[PDB]
Write a protein that binds this ligand. Structure first.
Ligand SMILES: Nc1ccc(S(=O)(=O)Nc2ccccn2)cc1
Length: 284
């Protein structure tokens, strides 16, 4: 029975290697990674891979791995797929831990923009969780942490992390991680998956997919929001993506809204992540 080697980049940046039978469905690999991670609250997570165009795709757990990675390497990343709106409602601390590690990468990468003060506060909770109480013996006036806190590090940010870290004496790791999450969950781009698109007039916009619905970023003024309940049908055709926007009270007709995506694969990808979010956050 022939088996393919899988390499998975974990959220701590380490590599997990395993073998699965070559006709295996994605769920097989995902189950092995989650067992390795001692993760029980698996519903919020998934594996990603890079397609022949180098775009991040979710590995569909119900489909054969080989029919998704196709010509590409069996290389994956473990990631948060559905960002819980209230991480305090998760049942296990280890779930909140992996969500923290993902968010730390969202921040360093710049996918999750963050004010100076929030970068420092999040950083201070990470340091408290990972090193425990502030120790002056490690931190002089010239201290720079090994922890990546931000897309661009400054001495001022390092100083503010230490100042806040001092305030957290006695805080346990689960407690610090919960504080991290109570702050992160409030950020306007928390758990927003962004897709480049054009509106029906060719004006470049961003579509964001998240727990609350679909977001349209036209300019810094005028951000449109479609709560999942207000969406009845998600569809794609060629390079186009469409949502059916339920009739408003006393309106005769549903309204259909149309976008142009970079190519057909990008329209299908956006359709699938929208359907999956609609399903997940209808049931939550
Ligand atoms: N994770 C997340 C991100 C953004 C938003 S929202 O504040 O824009 N609110 C809404 C409300 C309805 C439809 C779309 N966004 C909410 C949650």
């Amino acid at each position: 029975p022939k088996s393919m080697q899988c390499k998975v980049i974990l959220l701590d940046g380490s590599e997990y290697t395993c073998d699965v039978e070559k006709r295996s469905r994605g769920q097989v690999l995902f189950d092995k990674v989650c067992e390795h991670l001692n993760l029980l609250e698996k519903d919020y997570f998934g594996l990603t891979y890079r397609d022949a165009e180098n775009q991040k795709n979710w590995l569909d757990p119900a489909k054969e791995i080989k029919k998704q990675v196709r010509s590409g390497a069996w290389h994956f990343s473990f990631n948060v797929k559905f960002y819980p709106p209230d991480p305090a409602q998760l049942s296990e601390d280890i779930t909140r831990y992996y969500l923290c590690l993902q968010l730390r990468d969202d921040i360093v990468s710049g996918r999750l923009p963050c004010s100076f003060v929030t970068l420092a506060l999040l950083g201070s909770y990470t340091v408290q969780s990972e090193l425990g109480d502030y120790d002056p013996d490690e931190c002089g006036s010239d201290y720079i942490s090994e922890f990546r806190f931000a897309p661009n590090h400054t001495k001022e940010l390092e100083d503010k992390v230490i100042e806040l870290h001092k305030s957290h004496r006695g805080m346990t790791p689960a407690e610090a991680e919960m504080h991290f999450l109570e702050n992160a969950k409030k950020l306007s781009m928390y758990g927003v998956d962004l897709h480049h698109a054009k509106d029906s007039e060719g004006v470049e916009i961003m579509l964001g997919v998240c727990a609350s619905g679909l977001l349209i970023y036209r300019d810094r003024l005028r951000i449109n929001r479609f709560a999942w309940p207000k969406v009845l049908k998600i569809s794609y055709k060629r390079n186009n993506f469409y949502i059916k926007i339920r009739p408003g009270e006393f309106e005769q007709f549903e309204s259909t809204i149309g976008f142009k995506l970079p190519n057909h694969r990008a329209a299908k990808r956006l359709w699938k992540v929208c359907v999956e979010h609609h399903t997940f956050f209808r049931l939550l």
